[PDB]
Amino acid sequence: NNYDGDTVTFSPTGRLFQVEYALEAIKQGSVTVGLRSNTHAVLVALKRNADELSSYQKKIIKCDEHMGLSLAGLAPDARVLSNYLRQQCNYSSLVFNRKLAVERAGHLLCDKAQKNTQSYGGRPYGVGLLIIGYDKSGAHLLEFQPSGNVTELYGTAIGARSQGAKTYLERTLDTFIKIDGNPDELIKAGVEAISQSLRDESLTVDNLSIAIVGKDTPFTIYDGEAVAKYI
Amino acid sequence: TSIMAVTFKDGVILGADSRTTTGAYIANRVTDKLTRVHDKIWCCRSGSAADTQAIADIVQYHLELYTSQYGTPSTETAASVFKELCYENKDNLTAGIIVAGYDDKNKGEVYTIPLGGSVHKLPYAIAGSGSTFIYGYCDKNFRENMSKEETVDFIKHSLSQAIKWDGSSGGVIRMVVLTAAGVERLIFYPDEYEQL
Amino acid sequence: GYDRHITIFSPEGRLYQVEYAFKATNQTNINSLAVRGKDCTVVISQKKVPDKLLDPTTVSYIFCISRTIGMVVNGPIPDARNAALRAKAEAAEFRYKYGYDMPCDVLAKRMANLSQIYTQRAYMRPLGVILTFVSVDEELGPSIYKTDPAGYYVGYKATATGPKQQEITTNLENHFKKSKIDHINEESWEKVVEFAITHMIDALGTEFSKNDLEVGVATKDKFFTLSAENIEERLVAIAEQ
Amino acid sequence: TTIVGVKFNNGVVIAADTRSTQGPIVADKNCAKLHRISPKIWCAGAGTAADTEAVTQLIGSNIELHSLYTSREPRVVSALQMLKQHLFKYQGHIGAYLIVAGVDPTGSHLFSIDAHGSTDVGYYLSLGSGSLAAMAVLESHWKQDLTKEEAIKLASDAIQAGIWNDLGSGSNVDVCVMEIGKDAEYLRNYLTPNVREEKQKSYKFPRGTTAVLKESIVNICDIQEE
Amino acid sequence: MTDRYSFSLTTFSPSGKLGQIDYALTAVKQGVTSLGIKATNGVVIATEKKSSSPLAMSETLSKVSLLTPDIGAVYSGMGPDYRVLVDKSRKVAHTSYKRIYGEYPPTKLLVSEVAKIMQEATQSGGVRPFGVSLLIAGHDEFNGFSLYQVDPSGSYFPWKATAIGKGSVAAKTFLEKRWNDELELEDAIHIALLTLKESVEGEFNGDTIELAIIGDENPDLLGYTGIPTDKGPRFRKLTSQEINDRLEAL
Amino acid sequence: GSRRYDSRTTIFSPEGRLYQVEYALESISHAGTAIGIMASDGIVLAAERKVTSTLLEQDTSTEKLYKLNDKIAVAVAGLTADAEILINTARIHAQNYLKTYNEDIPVEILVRRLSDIKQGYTQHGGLRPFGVSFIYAGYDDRYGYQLYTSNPSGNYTGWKAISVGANTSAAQTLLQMDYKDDMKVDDAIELALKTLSKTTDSSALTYDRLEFATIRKGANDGEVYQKIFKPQEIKDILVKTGIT
Amino acid sequence: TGYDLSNSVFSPDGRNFQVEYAVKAVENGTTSIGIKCNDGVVFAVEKLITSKLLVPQKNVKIQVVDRHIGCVYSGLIPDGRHLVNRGREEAASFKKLYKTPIPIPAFADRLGQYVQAHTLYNSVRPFGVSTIFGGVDKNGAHLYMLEPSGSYWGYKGAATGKGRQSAKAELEKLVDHHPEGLSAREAVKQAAKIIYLAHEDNKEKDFELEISWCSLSETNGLHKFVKGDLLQEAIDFAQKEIN
Amino acid sequence: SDPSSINGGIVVAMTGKDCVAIACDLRLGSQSLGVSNKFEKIFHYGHVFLGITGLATDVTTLNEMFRYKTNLYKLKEERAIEPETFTQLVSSSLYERRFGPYFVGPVVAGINSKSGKPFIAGFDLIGCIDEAKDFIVSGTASDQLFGMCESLYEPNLEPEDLFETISQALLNAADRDALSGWGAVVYIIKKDEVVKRYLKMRQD
Amino acid sequence: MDIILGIRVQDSVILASSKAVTRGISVLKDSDDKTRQLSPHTLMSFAGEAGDTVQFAEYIQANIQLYSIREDYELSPQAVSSFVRQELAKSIRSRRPYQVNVLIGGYDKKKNKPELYQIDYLGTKVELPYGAHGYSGFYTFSLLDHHYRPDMTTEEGLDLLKLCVQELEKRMPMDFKGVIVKIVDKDGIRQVDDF
Ligand SMILES: [Cl-]
Numbered sequence A: 001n002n003y004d005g006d007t008v009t010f011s012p013t014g015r016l017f018q019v020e021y022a023l024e025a026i027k028q029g030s031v032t033v034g035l036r037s038n039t040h041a042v043l044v045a046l047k048r049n050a051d052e053l054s055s056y057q058k059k060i061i062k063c064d065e066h067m068g069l070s071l072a073g074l075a076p077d078a079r080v081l082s083n084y085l086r087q088q089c090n091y092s093s094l095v096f097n098r099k100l101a102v103e104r105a106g107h108l109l110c111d112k113a114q115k116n117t118q119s120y121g122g123r124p125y126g127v128g129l130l131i132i133g134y135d136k137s138g139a140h141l142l143e144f145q146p147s148g149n150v151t152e153l154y155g156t157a158i159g160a161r162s163q164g165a166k167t168y169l170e171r172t173l174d175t176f177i178k179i180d181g182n183p184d185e186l187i188k189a190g191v192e193a194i195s196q197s198l199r200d201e202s203l204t205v206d207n208l209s210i211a212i213v214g215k216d217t218p219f220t221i222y223d224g225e226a227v228a229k230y231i
Numbered sequence B: 001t002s003i004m005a006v007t008f009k010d011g012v013i014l015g016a017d018s019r020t021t022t023g024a025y026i027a028n029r030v031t032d033k034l035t036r037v038h039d040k041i042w043c044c045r046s047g048s049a050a051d052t053q054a055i056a057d058i059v060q061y062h063l064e065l066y067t068s069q070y071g072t073p074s075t076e077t078a079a080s081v082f083k084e085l086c087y088e089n090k091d092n093l094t095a096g097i098i099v100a101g102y103d104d105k106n107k108g109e110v111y112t113i114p115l116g117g118s119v120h121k122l123p124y125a126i127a128g129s130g131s132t133f134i135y136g137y138c139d140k141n142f143r144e145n146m147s148k149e150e151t152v153d154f155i156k157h158s159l160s161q162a163i164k165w166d167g168s169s170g171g172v173i174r175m176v177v178l179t180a181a182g183v184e185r186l187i188f189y190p191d192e193y194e195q196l
Numbered sequence C: 001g002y003d004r005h006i007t008i009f010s011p012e013g014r015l016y017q018v019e020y021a022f023k024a025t026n027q028t029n030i031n032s033l034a035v036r037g038k039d040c041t042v043v044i045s046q047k048k049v050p051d052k053l054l055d056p057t058t059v060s061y062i063f064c065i066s067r068t069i070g071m072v073v074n075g076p077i078p079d080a081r082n083a084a085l086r087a088k089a090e091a092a093e094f095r096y097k098y099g100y101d102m103p104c105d106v107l108a109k110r111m112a113n114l115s116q117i118y119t120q121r122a123y124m125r126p127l128g129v130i131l132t133f134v135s136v137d138e139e140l141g142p143s144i145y146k147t148d149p150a151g152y153y154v155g156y157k158a159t160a161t162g163p164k165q166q167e168i169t170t171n172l173e174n175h176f177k178k179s180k181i182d183h184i185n186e187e188s189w190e191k192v193v194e195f196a197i198t199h200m201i202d203a204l205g206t207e208f209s210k211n212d213l214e215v216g217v218a219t220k221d222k223f224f225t226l227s228a229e230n231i232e233e234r235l236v237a238i239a240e241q
Numbered sequence D: 001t002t003i004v005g006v007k008f009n010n011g012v013v014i015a016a017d018t019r020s021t022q023g024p025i026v027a028d029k030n031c032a033k034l035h036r037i038s039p040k041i042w043c044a045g046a047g048t049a050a051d052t053e054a055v056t057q058l059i060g061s062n063i064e065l066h067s068l069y070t071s072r073e074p075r076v077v078s079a080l081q082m083l084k085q086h087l088f089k090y091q092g093h094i095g096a097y098l099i100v101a102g103v104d105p106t107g108s109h110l111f112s113i114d115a116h117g118s119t120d121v122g123y124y125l126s127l128g129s130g131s132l133a134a135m136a137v138l139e140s141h142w143k144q145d146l147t148k149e150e151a152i153k154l155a156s157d158a159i160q161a162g163i164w165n166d167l168g169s170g171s172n173v174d175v176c177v178m179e180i181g182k183d184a185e186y187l188r189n190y191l192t193p194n195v196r197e198e199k200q201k202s203y204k205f206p207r208g209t210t211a212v213l214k215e216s217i218v219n220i221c222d223i224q225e226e
Numbered sequence E: 001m002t003d004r005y006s007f008s009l010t011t012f013s014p015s016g017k018l019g020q021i022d023y024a025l026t027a028v029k030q031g032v033t034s035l036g037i038k039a040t041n042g043v044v045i046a047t048e049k050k051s052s053s054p055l056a057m058s059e060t061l062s063k064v065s066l067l068t069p070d071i072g073a074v075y076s077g078m079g080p081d082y083r084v085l086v087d088k089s090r091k092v093a094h095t096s097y098k099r100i101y102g103e104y105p106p107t108k109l110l111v112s113e114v115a116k117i118m119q120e121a122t123q124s125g126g127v128r129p130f131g132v133s134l135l136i137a138g139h140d141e142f143n144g145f146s147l148y149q150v151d152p153s154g155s156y157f158p159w160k161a162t163a164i165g166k167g168s169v170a171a172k173t174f175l176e177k178r179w180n181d182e183l184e185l186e187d188a189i190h191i192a193l194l195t196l197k198e199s200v201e202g203e204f205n206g207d208t209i210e211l212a213i214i215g216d217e218n219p220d221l222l223g224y225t226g227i228p229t230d231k232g233p234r235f236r237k238l239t240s241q242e243i244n245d246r247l248e249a250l
Numbered sequence F: 001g002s003r004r005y006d007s008r009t010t011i012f013s014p015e016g017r018l019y020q021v022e023y024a025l026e027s028i029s030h031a032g033t034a035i036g037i038m039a040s041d042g043i044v045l046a047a048e049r050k051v052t053s054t055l056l057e058q059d060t061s062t063e064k065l066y067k068l069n070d071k072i073a074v075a076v077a078g079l080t081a082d083a084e085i086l087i088n089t090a091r092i093h094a095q096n097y098l099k100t101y102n103e104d105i106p107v108e109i110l111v112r113r114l115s116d117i118k119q120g121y122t123q124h125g126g127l128r129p130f131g132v133s134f135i136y137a138g139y140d141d142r143y144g145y146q147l148y149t150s151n152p153s154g155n156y157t158g159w160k161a162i163s164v165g166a167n168t169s170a171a172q173t174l175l176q177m178d179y180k181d182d183m184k185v186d187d188a189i190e191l192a193l194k195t196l197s198k199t200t201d202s203s204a205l206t207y208d209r210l211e212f213a214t215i216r217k218g219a220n221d222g223e224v225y226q227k228i229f230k231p232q233e234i235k236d237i238l239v240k241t242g243i244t
Numbered sequence G: 001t002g003y004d005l006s007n008s009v010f011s012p013d014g015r016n017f018q019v020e021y022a023v024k025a026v027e028n029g030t031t032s033i034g035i036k037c038n039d040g041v042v043f044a045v046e047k048l049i050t051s052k053l054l055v056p057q058k059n060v061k062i063q064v065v066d067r068h069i070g071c072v073y074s075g076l077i078p079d080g081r082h083l084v085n086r087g088r089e090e091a092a093s094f095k096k097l098y099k100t101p102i103p104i105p106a107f108a109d110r111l112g113q114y115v116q117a118h119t120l121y122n123s124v125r126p127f128g129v130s131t132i133f134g135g136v137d138k139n140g141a142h143l144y145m146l147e148p149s150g151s152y153w154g155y156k157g158a159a160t161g162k163g164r165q166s167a168k169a170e171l172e173k174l175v176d177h178h179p180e181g182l183s184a185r186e187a188v189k190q191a192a193k194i195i196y197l198a199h200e201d202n203k204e205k206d207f208e209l210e211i212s213w214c215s216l217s218e219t220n221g222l223h224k225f226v227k228g229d230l231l232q233e234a235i236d237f238a239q240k241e242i243n
Numbered sequence H: 001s002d003p004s005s006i007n008g009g010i011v012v013a014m015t016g017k018d019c020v021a022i023a024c025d026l027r028l029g030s031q032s033l034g035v036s037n038k039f040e041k042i043f044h045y046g047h048v049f050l051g052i053t054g055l056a057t058d059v060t061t062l063n064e065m066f067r068y069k070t071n072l073y074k075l076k077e078e079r080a081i082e083p084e085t086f087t088q089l090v091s092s093s094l095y096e097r098r099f100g101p102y103f104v105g106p107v108v109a110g111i112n113s114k115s116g117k118p119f120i121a122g123f124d125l126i127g128c129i130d131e132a133k134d135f136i137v138s139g140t141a142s143d144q145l146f147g148m149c150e151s152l153y154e155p156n157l158e159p160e161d162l163f164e165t166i167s168q169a170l171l172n173a174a175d176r177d178a179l180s181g182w183g184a185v186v187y188i189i190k191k192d193e194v195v196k197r198y199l200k201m202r203q204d
Numbered sequence I: 001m002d003i004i005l006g007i008r009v010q011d012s013v014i015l016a017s018s019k020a021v022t023r024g025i026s027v028l029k030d031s032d033d034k035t036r037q038l039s040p041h042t043l044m045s046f047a048g049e050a051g052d053t054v055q056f057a058e059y060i061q062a063n064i065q066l067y068s069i070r071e072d073y074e075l076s077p078q079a080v081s082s083f084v085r086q087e088l089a090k091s092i093r094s095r096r097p098y099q100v101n102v103l104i105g106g107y108d109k110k111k112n113k114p115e116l117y118q119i120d121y122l123g124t125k126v127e128l129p130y131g132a133h134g135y136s137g138f139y140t141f142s143l144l145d146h147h148y149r150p151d152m153t154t155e156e157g158l159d160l161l162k163l164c165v166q167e168l169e170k171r172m173p174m175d176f177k178g179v180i181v182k183i184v185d186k187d188g189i190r191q192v193d194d195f
């Protein structure tokens, strides 16, 4: 009200409204799902078009051979944060000959977002991210909020109507965690999860976007006729 | 210069000659090379007189500010502050410093910091141009846990020989005793130590 | 009405942020007192530990700035420690640059100049503290110099700070009106501390245990604080006459 | 240059010769080498003459501001600390070699300063090209508990040794006495043992000896009215 | 952090007034009365030592300050603002003059430098004006004795005699009746004490009054002998006893 | 943050006016009147000191007329402290030009430089403008005798006769009525004083309330002299012209 | 009014309302505690299980500084991480210059001055966390608690977050019933109980317990996390006490 | 190579009874090659006179610099600068270039307008003041000038006698220096009149 | 480059400059014009280190042309020469100084007088009746000292210049491939196309 003009102002109840408004941009964004087993980790993302002449906005970005994310909200902010992750993954490899841990990648994203919530002049990031990866401690899935809060999960979903997919994963928890050594079945579960968030529209060949990383599987993105198999 | 510091049962004693030279001219025959950076943390200076005075003054400032915030510093801490200055400015400095101090927990300690800026904790240390001539004597005659009187004699005899052979060393032998009892200054004149 | 938010003049020629910083000074609800002897300067302050979970040894508003200078603060602890760290840094730098120990009055002036800047520059707020510096100066002898959020400072024969400063001030005024001298005519610092505690008891009308007080003493070449058992010995002597 | 400093009973005295040179040529025969840092803190300088004055006036200026700020009379240790730190920063490139002496509320003091920033303490000191000649006299005649009259005598004798035996030094002896609880007395040309003898001949020319091409009045006044 | 107030806090209002300067003058009006009188052979500046507490040692607070050996200053308004201006004025006398010309600045030029500092606090970013008016008295070889007033705006004017602060309007009227061009220094001191008594409520003596003069050279205050051309400072602060002696012949 | 307290000194109004410039001009309209008149054989600068006192030391006082160099002078109307900042800058610029080209700075080049400095404060920096208007009286060998004015906007214009400060509307009408092109300095002196005498808000025009200056080639042969009038000399010219 | 819209502005009371609003964010956070024992310190925290999809034991909240200091906080988690990052820089520079690891009181002031600095300007926001921290140094065990204002004191026991009143009462009982002191292993057990008891203020969702400790005898003066059998033993002790 | 002897030239100054004199040669060269016989080395700012020997570019630069500074001085002080004050300004200005100096040998001469006292002073390239009672010399034939002045000079010479002394000192010194000569100028300075005389000399 | 000469006569200034450009072993060009017009009545010739010469001359040209447009007025030769001197005096204490020597020939329309200024790379300025840079003066000055008169015509000045060039062509070891000659007078600048 009187306390939402900038990010440097707490409200009388201790809230940061500019950060909450940045969180609101994520809820307007298109749905994206993340889930993992012990061998693989999967991202599924519903891409959004402007109209029938337009292309479908890309949702998944590769950060390294063993790591990548999906976005929901302001796409340019995801480009800035993913570029930062690419650099940090790269610094780790060049200097220490070491693949960057997924947990440590989450810590770096948290700290970068935090600086934009405590200083005058700047603004919070207006995007949410789902980071998947496979490192020395197996498969990982992270959820990033632009408040700075990063959380490690078995599965999750962000964007509009994400609550349906999140409930489905909460039921299926015991089943999909056990899908080891079978990439196709893990993606099937992810496609079935994101389907619980659809209304009026369905999953078409240029609508669906899938990514996977695992034990002997580099981070690869599937689009176009490559995902017709899963429709 | 001829300087040395020796730990003993009750603490530590620092020793030094008093000669400062510009070439063959003795610019000061009554110099005080034993310098106070804290109540019971002193140092011995060798090398450039400008450099070692500048360093000691900065260390004294650092330890005074340390004391106001965190209480009495350790001898190890004082040696570290000396090292940081000597190492990081090695290209522009010519300083060889021996740091000696007395804690109640750690008792007498000695740290030597040569040209490069390395640190070496030792039971006793010798340095300066005149030290070269007494490596043999000191190694043969040093014992651990000596008494105050024995340590005074060891330093007196050692620096006497260093003075005898090194033209750069001479004058009076100054000493500073660091124990739980406090801080005692000693001085020994040529007529005394030359006849040893 | 933004002339009340930053340090600019109001139509009356007043600085409201400075005035409100003076009010923050009494937020701790603690009273302090300082007096001079022949060879010493004594400062006492109330100690209140309201929580049982607190470590009472860490609760203090008296600071050892240098070997010779001590400082008691009236105001919130964050601003107090801010001022303490700065004073310690200034005292150390002074000694390094000018080759002698920073006098009590000179440090007071320096901290007062820093405070003045906060009243003139808009981006910096005033510190909500009153700083009382004490020492036995090698030139001026026993010394009390006090600084406030306005950037004002002055020397004192004796002084008092806190919510009930006026009661303590008048009590001290009346004593010096009798004796007609600028100090406590006493040889030992122990008896000067006893004078300070007695006259605070009289002015406030309250009794003190060993844990209710905090004492600092300045002598030639050192300033130190008394322990709870040192204060107890002081309280026993007061009660026995 | 020859400069000395000598401690005595209730104060300190400094002295200097008055010759300044450009190589083998005498630039000024009556040079003033005793500089004032503050009313009761004086110093004598050898080496690069511009540097000794420049560094003395800078520190003297800052000492004055410091004295006003602290409401205290300046101390010699403050002048010493400010001088050595300035000279150390410039790594010897500021060629100032100083003997600093004075009285203050702490007492009487005598220090020497080298261009690289090293300082030392003493009862008697000497600096400059004639320092070895001066130090020979000081080592021969100095004792503890000198009077004011004895210290002035010893200091000037040490400068004379420099004047007569060192080619870098000559002409007159300047002295400054700083006694505790008294005004510092600056004795300019305390000794004058080198007056030139009368010449054999007058070299005043007959008027009109020099050939002239043109004469003209130079306008030094401003632009005029009317 | 960083100072993000890079804009002016003093601005013109629709009527053409600079509000912050006017309000600074209002602060000066509330301040204790100080005055200055120029004589043929000297200048006097005076003020009341309004002690905040009787426990306070008012000798440790100097309202009259030496700027150079031949220049002094007094104020009315905010004390702390005055103290920092004296520090800056003393330094600028050296950095922008003595370190260049090897001599102390004349009164009018030092005043000019102080004025410049006060003007900049009226236009620079993120600062308020100084809440003081200064009276600066001094002597120099080519201009002789002079007295200047400096205001928060940075404006300065030369005076034969004037007053600033609490009771300035009444004090200036009193000075107009008494001032003439044939006054000796002692006559000016006498008039200064008479004028100041009107604006003082309580005690009126050497301990509650601060008074200094710019007069003859004081070789006794120089600190050294031996240089004929150095004859000592013309600024001298009168003692408590010296003031009381002249209050008997009042 | 800090934005809250920013007055924004360098913005346009909806009508396309610079608020602060307009308000600074309002300030200048209350300042003492300054007049400049240009003749064939010289220039006159006359200006009124604001309500003075009998205890003001006049002979050592200067609030209106300032020397920039030997050939150029200025009359001030507005904040004196603001004017002295600009005056010192102008004195330095003249000396920079003299050092570079070994010739005295042409009057217009100096005027343009100061005016450009004023302009900067209206377009960038977020600072308040200088509350000063200048009348420049000067001579150079290109255009001869010249009169200019500049104001807080940084705009400058040339004049045969001009006024700034208080009552400029009334003053300009009186000058427009009696000014002629073949006029001489002694006639211009009389016009300037007569104009001030009629436009003044004071009861009468006396020597102690005036500052006066002339720039004449009345200097011995081909050269220019600046004359800042002394108090006694202003008193004499007032009797000569028949005002007192 | 308007005094609460900008940081570093004194109200007519002499209060900084923005700092007081930061405390509200702290009070909204989960419960965290600290217990000072005979030769060390114990830290514990309540972690709310928002969903079954949270991986157990993975989202670690307690943080180490250097090798001898533990830090836990309630309120805005990112703000706490920013404070710990600064603390790690402060501890690194101290050890770089002075060789010895930073003493706990020295470390406390470094955090305090940094937090206090965020109350001096309107260009920054105050910290939305209260931090409980401590460890073992040359002078023994130390426990501190630091507020948004920059204020900190030493503590025998400390608590913050939504269930702070409940926790404080439990800590006060331990101080009274053990004047001679508490052992390290006892403190771990007691810490588990207090978090379980303080969970009544957050009873809607179930939670995960996390404990750490520094002890001269049990951990050689190094900070370590309580894991496996010792953690389960403390959970069993806690569950037994609530029933 | 040596900057102080590329262009050549000399300046000398002397005191007399209620007067001062300052004189210089007129040569400017490029080592052996004589380039100009009209290069005057004496300038004046009000009643204060400044001679400058050494590297010619710096001679020109410093003249322009001191004209600049004495003009600003006059506007602010409302009076002409005096010889004693100007001497300090030259010293300050030279020392600010301590580690990148102007290669010059300045000489100040003038009479104090208030006291009437004759004044002369000399400087090294980096600011050290030599303020002699009798005479000051500068330039590539300074050794020769020292020899002439030391024998020819006597105190309290009348203006017209002082002219002969300083003229003979310059001329004979210049004739023993390869890089000096090609004409000469002498200024005789009294409290309110200054006479300038060009001398006839050998042109080799 | 090599030889640059200048002579000021009654009513004009004449500048002569060599045409050769040599890159060590070979003569790359024999028609090079070592001069720039700064303003309608001011010409500057130059010689010094390769590259620096043209870079400096064009930089000066641009500055004087900028001044002419801003003020709608041509600077006097004296004013231009002072500006050039200051730039070279500034240059000599730079990181990498301009190694350039110049002659500035101009006709002052106010005073109705020709003017010749000689400035070397150090910033050493002198006004002269005739001047040169490098070794050119060593061969030519003895002839100019003998024959020069202040009341010479332009045609007499050219004839005296021919005698100077002939002496250079006889006694100089280097082949400078003749000279381009330009005249500066009240009507402006023109080139003598047969010399
Ligand atoms: Cl300060």
Ligand SMILES: [Mg+2]
Binding pocket: B163, B164, B165, B166, B167, B168, B169, B170
């Ligand atoms: Mg030997």
Ligand SMILES: [Mg+2]
Binding pocket: C006, C007, C117, C118, C119, C120, C121, C122, C123, C124, C125, C126
């Ligand atoms: Mg402020």
Ligand SMILES: [Mg+2]
Binding pocket: H174, H175, H176, H177, H178, H179, H180, H181, H204
């Ligand atoms: Mg010759």
Ligand SMILES: [Mg+2]
Binding pocket: H203, H204
């Ligand atoms: Mg020849």
